[PDB]
């Protein structure tokens, strides 16, 4: 049975901060963030939230569908660690604003940055079940980092905002899944967590060690299930959950040293060939939590070579923790479709924040904290940011009125 990603679309925010500006502002040398392969992070405005990010990521997918094909979407899974209610799924708002069928299962899925992968696997299994032949699923991984002015101070440089939408079906035009080629591994660990709203706590050192343990053990489980697979030879590219690129470089090095006994120069050449293409877009948005691996996939497709079909290995990790290694294939035709989305152009067109604007943005973010009952957003907070958004057919958060979020196309 054929299954996988029929369409993929990204929203990398309306504004970004260049991390060199953050380094300068805190008296650090530039080399610290360049060293860690970090360039820019996306930053959500007060009039954006994970719903608006999600809708903006999915809108190009839905716009292309025939009415018949839009009506075939019968499951919407929102994957997030940035939820807005203890019970109400963001999927309900997403369905409303995309105009989807009422005959649609809707829910939200949580397991830190593993959420996206978990949603994708549930969607794959809907198609494989053949319970509703022809049904499609829409999986949207969406997350923002709404720091308020800390427990979160360790994560400021790395924590971005972004969403990636996947249409999943039996005609996988973009990414053809290797069915049943999955390894997964998890255990309870306090590496990082989000025990309060609008916040994150943890020991990033423990988290890196746990990521490395899971990278090894999830892949071993896959290897046990896929006889004769080779970590170098079977995968043309590798995409990873990417908290920052430097640690993905470290993980890949650890894997190559253990599995292939590769020498340092050989490992570095392999890194540039197979792993760097996936980092390109990640470096422009920062860690976007459950969406990051999907962004890495999109980056691999756009920035790698698909003149013949290629197999991509995928590694997902979420703190707390759970992980999965899985794989699929992209054809030249699929890569050509992906290129038409113009992700690189979208990212280049975002507003570049000054450090003054960024600090103001943080200060102004308290007005839309978790649990807000009533707020009316000022779209002219930053007139220049608005000029970049207005007229593009973007969804924004207009207001919250008695906990009901109201959105507007601008």
């Amino acid at each position: 049975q054929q299954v996988g990603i029929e369409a993929l679309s990204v929203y990398g925010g309306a504004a970004q901060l260049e991390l060199r500006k953050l380094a300068q502002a805190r008296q650090l040398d530039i080399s610290r963030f360049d060293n860690l392969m970090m360039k820019e992070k996306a930053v959500s405005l007060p009039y954006e939230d994970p719903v608006s990010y999600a809708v903006n990521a999915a809108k190009p997918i839905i716009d292309r569908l025939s009415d018949a094909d839009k009506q075939r979407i019968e499951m919407v899974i929102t994957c997030s660690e940035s939820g807005i209610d203890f019970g109400k799924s963001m999927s309900t708002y997403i369905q409303e604003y995309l105009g989807l069928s009422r005959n649609c299962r809707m829910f939200e899925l949580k397991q830190a940055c593993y959420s996206g992968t978990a949603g994708l696997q549930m969607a794959i299994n809907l198609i494989l079940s053949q319970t509703f032949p022809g049904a499609k699923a829409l999986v949207i991984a969406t997350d923002i980092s709404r720091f308020l002015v800390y427990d979160w101070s360790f994560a400021e440089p790395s924590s971005g905002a972004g969403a990636v939408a996947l249409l999943v079906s039996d005609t996988p035009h973009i990414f053809q899944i290797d069915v049943g080629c999955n390894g997964y591994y998890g255990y309870e660990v306090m590496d990082t967590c989000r025990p309060n709203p609008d916040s994150e706590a943890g020991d990033a050192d423990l988290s890196l060690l746990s990521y490395l343990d899971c990278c090894e053990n999830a892949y071993r489980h896959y290897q046990n299930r896929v006889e004769g697979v080779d970590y170098r030879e079977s995968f043309d590219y590798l995409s990873f959950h990417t908290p920052f690129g430097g640690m993905v470089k470290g993980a890949h090095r650890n894997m190559m040293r253990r599995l292939k006994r590769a020498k340092p120069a050989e490992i570095e050449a392999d890194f540039q060939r197979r792993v760097m293409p996936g980092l390109v877009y990640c470096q422009q948005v920062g860690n976007i939590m459950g969406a990051t691996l999907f962004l890495s996939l999109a980056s691999t497709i756009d920035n790698g070579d698909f003149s013949t079909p290629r197999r991509i290995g995928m590694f997902s990790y979420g703190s707390g923790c759970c992980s999965e290694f899985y794989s699929g294939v992209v054809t030249p035709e699929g890569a050509a479709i992906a290129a038409q989305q113009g992700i690189s152009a979208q990212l280049a067109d975002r507003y570049s924040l000054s450090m003054e604007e960024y600090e103001q943005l943080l200060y102004h973010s308290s007005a839309v904290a978790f649990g807000t009952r009533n707020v009316t957003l000022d779209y002219q907070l930053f007139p220049g940011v608005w000029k970049k958004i207005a007229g593009k057919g973007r969804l924004v958060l207009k207001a919250i009125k008695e906990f009901h979020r109201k959105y507007e196309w601008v």
Binding site: L36, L206, L208, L209, L212, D213, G246, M247, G250
Partner: protein
């Protein structure tokens, strides 16, 4: 192997990772973070020491130390 033998091995890979500390005295109370060793390289040092000692256990079992002396203690307790 003992706490003091392991501390020597931690000092070796620390200097190998940060060549600028080659001719610097490192004390048990020194922390890799305060020495300027970044997040990726702090993990790398742990993994190099694990491999030197043929210690094939989960990497997270070496987490939580606040200085190199405490890291030495963690390794010593595992074998």
């Amino acid at each position: 192997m003992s706490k003091e033998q392991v501390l020597k091995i931690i000092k070796k890979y620390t200097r190998e990772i940060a060549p600028e500390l080659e001719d610097s005295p490192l004390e048990p109370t020194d922390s890799l973070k305060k020495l300027g060793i970044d997040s990726v390289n702090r993990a790398e040092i742990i993994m190099m020491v694990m491999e030197d000692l043929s210690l094939n256990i989960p990497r997270i079992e070496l987490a939580g130390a606040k200085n190199i002396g405490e890291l030495a203690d963690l390794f010593a307790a595992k074998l």
